[PDB]
């Protein structure tokens, strides 16, 4: 997160760190047994770390739970990054409390200008901060999104952030949450680097995937 601020400890209780030796991506807890993240974050082995703030210090309120299943969207395209979404089933249910909580899936898509909260331990320009970073940022119109990335924005992508630059999610934030009005509307997906002028962050449009997410949870 560039141009952000340090989150209050555990103030983002749906935020998880994906770890395979070190932190490599974010995710969002959306069910006691399931985390949603980005398909481009895929690894065959993943430890989910919930209740984190300082990922480099054992504070005590963390829950470390290995991934038992990892399901990438069947129509995920690694070129266009269309359908950049992945579900992780936890080996055991996360225990929900004040510091570890589910975030609601969208009830509808979000209108342009809706204020969101983006968070992660990604780059802020060894590279990554210890402490979870936060950024407030608005949903941009589909127009501003498409203008910025001609021919590259599908119906499954939203831009969230600032055309001006200096405020954006970066590598390491990938797979992490964009939450607007209590609902997970975006998953950190891609961009042209980060925080550059007229290159706002591009995010998987979660409001298109509620039925696929529910189906996947129901089946597995």
Q: Which residues pair with 157 in a beta bridge?
A: 204
Residue 130 found at the interface with Ca ion (CB under 5 A) = no
Q: Which of 132, 140, 178, 194 binds Na ion (CB under 5 A)?
A: 132
Q: Where are the beta strands (DSSP E) in the chain?
A: 5-6, 15-19, 23-31, 34-37, 47-50, 63-72, 86-90, 115-120, 133-138, 157-160, 177-180, 183-190, 201-205
180 binds, among Na ion, Ca ion, none (CB under 5 to 8 A by kind): none
Distance of CA 143 to CAs 48, 109, 118, 190, Å?
A: 36, 16, 21, 17
168 is known to lie in a ligand binding site: yes
Give the closest residue to 203 by CA, choosing from 180, 213, 101, 181. Answer: 180
From the CB of 192, what's the least distance to Ca ion, in Å?
A: 32
Selected catalytic residue, list 84, 119, 173, 189: 84
Q: Which is nearer to Na ion, 110 or 132 (CB)?
A: 132
Q: Does 59 bind Ca ion (CB under 5 A)?
A: yes
Q: Tell me: is residue 52 an annotated ligand-binding position.
A: yes
With CB cut-offs between 5 and 8 Å by kind, which of Na ion, Ca ion, none does residue 164 bind? none
Q: Site size for Na ion, by CB under 5 A?
A: 3
14-192-177 Cα angle (round to 5)? 5
Provide the 10 A C-beta neighbour count for residue 210: 15
Q: Note whether 168 binds Na ion by CB under 5 A.
A: no
- Is residue 53 a contact residue for Na ion (CB under 5 A)? yes
Provide the minimum distance between the beta carbon of 63 and Ca ion in the complex, in angstroms, as a whole number: 11
Record the tokens describing residue 102, joined without a space.
């589910």
Q: Mark the segment that binds Na ion (CB under 5 A) among 8-16, 27-35, 135-143, 154-162.
A: 8-16
Pull the structure tokens for residue 188: 């950190």
Min dist CB 8 to Na ion, Å, is 7
Please indicate whether residue 84 is annotated as part of the active site: yes
Given the complex with Ca ion, which of 54 and 147 has the nearer CB atom? 54
**Following DSSP, what letter does each residue of 93-130 receive, concatenated?**
PPPPSSSS---BPPSSPPPTT-EEEEEES------S-S
21's torsion region: left (phi>0), alpha (psi -120 to 50) or beta? left
Residue 132 vs 179, nearer CB to Na ion: 132
Which of 32, 54, 80, 208 binds Ca ion (CB under 5 A)? It is 54
Contacting residues toward Na ion, per CB under 5 A: 10, 53, 132
Task: Give the annotated binding-site residues.
Answer: 52, 54, 57, 62, 168-169, 171-172, 174
List active site positions.
40, 84, 174
């Amino acid at each position: 997160i560039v141009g952000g601020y340090t989150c209050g400890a555990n103030t983002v209780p749906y935020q998880v760190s994906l770890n395979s030796g070190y932190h490599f991506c974010g995710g969002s807890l959306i069910n006691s047994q399931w985390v949603v993240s980005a398909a481009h974050c895929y690894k065959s082995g993943i430890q989910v770390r919930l209740g984190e703030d300082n990922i480099n210090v054992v504070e005590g309120n963390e829950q470390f739970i290995s991934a038992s299943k990892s399901i990438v969207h069947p129509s995920y395209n690694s070129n266009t990054l269309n359908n950049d979404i992945m579900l992780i089933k936890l080996k055991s249910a996360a225990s929900l409390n004040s510091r570890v909580a589910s975030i609601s899936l969208p009830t509808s898509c979000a209108s342009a200008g809706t204020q969101c909260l983006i968070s992660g331990w990604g780059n802020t320009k060894t590279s990554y901060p210890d402490v979870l970073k936060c950024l407030k940022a608005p949903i941009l119109s589909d127009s501003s999104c498409k203008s910025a990335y001609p021919g590259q924005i599908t119906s499954n992508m939203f831009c969230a952030g600032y055309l001006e630059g200096g405020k954006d999610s970066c590598q390491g934030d990938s797979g992490g949450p964009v939450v607007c009005s209590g609902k997970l509307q975006g998953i950190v997906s891609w961009g042209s680097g980060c925080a550059q002028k007229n290159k706002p962050g591009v995010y998987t449009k979660v409001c298109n995937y509620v039925s696929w997410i529910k189906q996947t949870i129901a089946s597995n």
